[PDB]
Design a protein around this nucleic acid. Structure first.
Ligand SMILES: [Zn+2]
Lengths: 216, 82, 83, 216, 265
RNA sequence: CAAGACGGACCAGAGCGAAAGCAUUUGCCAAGAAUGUUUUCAUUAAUCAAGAACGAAAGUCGGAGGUUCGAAGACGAUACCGUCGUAGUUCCGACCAUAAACGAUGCCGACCGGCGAUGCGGCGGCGUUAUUCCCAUGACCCGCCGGGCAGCUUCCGG
RNA sequence: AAAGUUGCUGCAGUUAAAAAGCUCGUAGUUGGAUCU
């Protein structure tokens, strides 16, 4: 972001990106998201250019650093595949998480027990989270979003072009956004990698967890 | 959308467009040297020719008119111009 | 706005949209104002400064908002030109 | 009065000065006590109409009172409130509440030669509601308001001293006609003029400025 | 003779042929069919319940995740594999079985994945179905301890390990062929025939790919070299702003001719 | 065997025509849109008062033929239905000029979101097929351009 | 005058009154760019 020779992509970054299957997208394309595609391979899967989503991650991180208070940032996920991840994203910085079913009127109905007034919104899945985008379009609330190729860009201000259906890709990209905001927020440096493994943010299936502790 | 330099379009987009709908219109055709296999003369042939072009020395059929580009016979060589 | 005496006769001045230069109305509840932080050019540290972009509700409703923010970031040099 | 919103907490204290810096950032107002504290010492109220609509069920037609009211401080702020309640006093009270929630600024301009306080609409505007079209035209000083009585009430409340008004459509429908002239005043504000061509210098948001106050 | 829950579901009464009939509690206490529960109270109780040692369960987990059959099978499948491996270990010496499973060979074909080969009721050219063959047609039909596994994942990993697998009939299995779902986006295979979304990438991108394994530990898996399967024809359409009946209507692409007075929902 | 009729299935989100309308094969006749064009002319154009050409079905004059169906009508039951059945339905030559003759929606031109299906023409390209066809061509596959018929989606705006 | 219900300013013609069955066609109306 700026060709300043410190915020560029690394070989480990591209290796782990291709390992986690983030770069490959869906089967649909929305015309507002044509600039994040490199090309269309004949198999039918749109690939997402890695430098474009790197710069978009850096822009989202620059937007989220600029808020001095980490408490008034909402981080929401309705699908389970990112749910626990955004909870640990709270453990990244303290941004308040909302996992599971979203209560209507959370942002717009002031006579509620759960009535929050954030300053940025970060969304795992725009299709499952249509109600929080609808409510964010009523209270002057900007929006970060993890957007696949088959994702609408209405009321979306930064759309992170990534595969968000798979658990590994969404957990990785939450971990990468957390690492960037913690890197240039002031907590950690650049000479040493973050001690938190990417597999910690990963959503685990109950079928996986019933046979994970069997191999102890 | 809402931000694209109409004065400087990408060259693949200009070649992609219809020949009249470019920024400055231009034809898709060309002229070409044709060398008959039975001789070594040069014949100047339009790519989208509508007449049967005959050899000036051999009096042989060089191209066959088609709906679009002319079909050169087998054995003759061709080279584009300019 | 101003009378011939030079006085400022107006309630206030509205913010103009950074994308399409539209006046952001007082009851435009879908419009945003966003702050993007820059970093130091040698060490990548948040130095406290910021840049401000306002997008009206019509541009956001069209879905053409992130394109506008990317173009503005290109204009201010935040996003690199090797895009 | 206890505040439940962040803007309510800001207006409860003497941290935010006037309503114009709410209007500059287009923030939604969800409490009538905000404008009661700001300018409620000079508001004047009036009811425009009351209509009982009937919803038939097996126990007869239940009667629902739609109250049409309008408020303003005769200086550049106007609001229009419609509420459907069960009896008359609750209808007018909640219509007062809604008209308080829908107070908009009124841009006033000159007709010519720019001497004294502005007195007219700055330009010819048009408001629409249903089939009703209301057009507001600047007038010289001392013209008064040339309107139907419902726009007379709305334009006196907005502080516009002089105006020419034209109307098309089913103006006998009072709700559509009052909403059309309210839309026309909102569009007096939302019009772009060469005196508003100066490049916008941006100011700190009140949420971002008063963030240590929301910490405590 | 290790009895899997599939043998209980199919009412496999093989208590006479085998004597070392042992299994785990959760594979028999998870059956939701009432007829199996009624039949369980009539059969003689020669069956014994035990739990495998943690070491052997763990090593089963590492070569299960090496062989690529890791997400397809459940924890009860892990327990069944561990119990039969322990029974083979304390009956016969452990030097017979092997590790580091053989790499899979590539062998494509021009046949379509939905070709109905080896389906009994059809006839490719003879091929006739008699009532005497209904009891015979169960699967592909060809010493002290065996297995009564039914699902192809456990049979696949057992034949990869070289352990002899048994069936509802007396004789063992020499060849085991079936269909699995392979992803063409992230190159991950799943043996679950009812799933439609992928595991790693998560797209609706799984396609039918055939597999066949033998006793020696050799596996060969067939693609299809047909461009009909891999093309993005009906895959892009504009979306509206946000059970098994009517299945063939979805398989039509939206960008096509439907009748003028009919409507898709 | 003959008589006249009518061209099923294929037959469609299809095609053609100014509309009304058009479906068995083959041959002849003259038109035609789109495409391709580094051809030719150089404003020759758009719209319609007057005026002219065609115009489903029914109907009217004259010739031919009447298979089926069938207004009116004769019987039998209960305006409905059945049996028989005239004009007509059919061809040729003249009249008639009317339809829910519909997109209940002038014509020409410009701008204004997206998608992928389809008919035709042109262009580019890995590749498969005419029992690994020994170069081209037809049939498919991918992509683009132009004029079309026609869908889905959108808080473009109305 | 209200009547933008005679509309040049300034109305309308899918479903409310309303676009000729279709095409050609003189009069009339309108007519690409270009010359210090
Ligand atoms: Zn996959």
């Amino acid at each position: 972001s700026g060709a300043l020779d410190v915020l560029q992509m690394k070989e480990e970054d591209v290796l782990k990106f291709l390992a986690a299957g983030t770069h490959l997208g869906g089967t649909n394309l929305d015309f507002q998201m044509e600039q994040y595609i490199y090309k269309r391979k004949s198999d039918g899967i749109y690939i997402i250019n890695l430098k474009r989503t790197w710069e978009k991650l850096l822009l989202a991180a620059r937007a989220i650093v600029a808020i001095e208070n980490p408490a008034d940032v909402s981080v929401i996920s309705s699908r389970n595949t990112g749910q626990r991840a955004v909870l640990k994203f709270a453990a990244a910085t303290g941004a308040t998480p909302i996992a599971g079913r979203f209560t209507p009127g959370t942002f717009t109905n002031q006579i509620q027990a759960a009535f929050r007034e954030p300053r940025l919104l970060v969304v795992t899945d725009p299709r499952a989270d249509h109600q929080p985008l609808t409510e964010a379009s009523y209270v002057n609330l900007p929006t970060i979003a993890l957007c696949n190729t088959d994702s609408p860009l209405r009321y979306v201000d930064i759309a992170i072009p990534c595969n968000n259906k798979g658990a590994h890709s969404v957990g990785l990209m939450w971990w990468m956004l957390a690492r960037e905001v913690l890197r240039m927020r002031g907590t950690i440096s650049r000479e040493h990698p973050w001690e938190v493994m990417p597999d910690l943010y990963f959503y685990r299936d109950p079928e996986e967890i019933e046979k994970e502790e069997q191999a102890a | 959308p809402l931000a694209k330099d109409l004065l400087h379009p990408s060259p693949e987009e200009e070649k992609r467009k219809h020949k009249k709908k470019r920024l400055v219109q231009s034809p898709n055709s060309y002229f070409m040297d044709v060398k008959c296999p039975g001789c070594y003369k040069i014949t100047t042939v339009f790519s989208h020719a509508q007449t049967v072009v005959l050899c000036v020395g051999c009096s042989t059929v060089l191209c066959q008119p088609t709906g679009g580009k002319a079909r050169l016979t087998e054995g003759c060589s061709f080279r584009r111009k300019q | 706005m101003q009378n011939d005496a030079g006085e400022f006769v107006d309630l206030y001045v509205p913010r103009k949209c950074s994308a399409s230069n539209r006046i952001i109305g007082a009851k435009d509840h879908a419009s945003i104002q966003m702050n993007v932080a820059e970093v130091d050019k040698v060490t990548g540290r948040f130095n406290g400064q910021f840049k401000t972009y306002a997008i009206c509700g019509a541009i956001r409703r069209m879905g053409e908002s992130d394109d506008s923010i990317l173009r503005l970031a290109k204009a201010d040099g935040i996003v690199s030109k090797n895009f | 009065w206890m505040p439940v919103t962040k803007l309510g907490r800001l207006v409860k204290d003497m941290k935010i000065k006037s309503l114009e810096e709410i209007y500059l950032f287009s923030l939604p107002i969800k409490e009538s006590e905000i404008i009661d504290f700001f300018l409620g010492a000079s508001l004047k109220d009036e009811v425009l109409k009351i209509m009982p609509v009937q919803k038939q069920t097996r126990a007869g037609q239940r009667t629902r009172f739609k109250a049409f009211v309008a408020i303003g401080d005769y200086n550049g702020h106007v609001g229009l409130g419609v509420k459907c309640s069960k009896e008359v006093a609750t209808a007018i009270r909640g219509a007062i509440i809604l008209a308080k929630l829908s107070i908009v600024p009124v841009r006033r301009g000159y007709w010519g030669n720019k001497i004294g306080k502005p007195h007219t609409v700055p330009c010819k505007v048009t408001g629409r509601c249903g089939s009703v079209l209301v057009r507001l035209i600047p007038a010289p000083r001392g013209t008064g308001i040339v309107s139907a009585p419902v726009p007379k009430k709305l334009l006196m409340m907005a502080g516009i001293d002089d105006c020419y008004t034209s109307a098309r459509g089913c103006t006998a429908t009072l709700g559509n006609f009052a909403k059309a002239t309210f839309d026309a005043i909102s569009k007096t504000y939302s019009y772009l003029t060469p005196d508003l061509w100066k490049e916008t210098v941006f100011t700190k948001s009140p949420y971002q400025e008063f963030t240590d106050h929301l910490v405590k | 003779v290790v009895a899997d829950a599939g043998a209980f579901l199919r009412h496999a009464a093989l208590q006479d042929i085998g004597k070392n009939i042992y299994t785990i509690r959760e594979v028999v206490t998870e059956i939701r069919d009432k007829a199996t529960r009624r039949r369980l109270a009539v059969l003689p109780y020669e069956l014994r319940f035990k739990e495998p040692l943690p070491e052997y369960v763990r090593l089963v987990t590492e070569f299960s995740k090496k062989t690529g059959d890791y997400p397809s099978l459940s924890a009860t499948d892990i327990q069944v594999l561990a119990l039969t491996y322990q029974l083979e270990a304390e009956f016969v010496g452990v030097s017979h079985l092997k590790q580091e499973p053989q790499k899979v060979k590539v062998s494509s074909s021009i046949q379509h994945p939905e070709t109905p080969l080896h389906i009994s009721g059809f006839h490719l050219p003879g091929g006739w179905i008699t009532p005497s063959n209904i009891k015979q047609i169960q699967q592909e039909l060809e010493v002290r301890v065996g297995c009564l596994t039914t699902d192809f994942a456990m049979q696949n990993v057992l034949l990869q390990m070289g352990l002899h697998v048994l069936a509802v009939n007396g004789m063992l299995i020499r060849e085991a062929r079936s269909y699995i779902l392979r992803c063409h986006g992230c190159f991950k295979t799943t043996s679950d025939m009812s799933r439609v979304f992928c595991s790693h990438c998560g797209n609706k991108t799984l396609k039918k790919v055939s597999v066949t394994v033998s006793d020696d530990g050799t596996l060969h898996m067939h693609f299809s070299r047909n461009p009909k399967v891999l093309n993005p024809r009906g895959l892009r359409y504009s979306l509206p702003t946000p059970s098994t009946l009517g299945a063939g209507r979805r398989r039509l692409n939206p960008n096509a001719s439907r009748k003028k007075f009919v409507k898709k929902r």
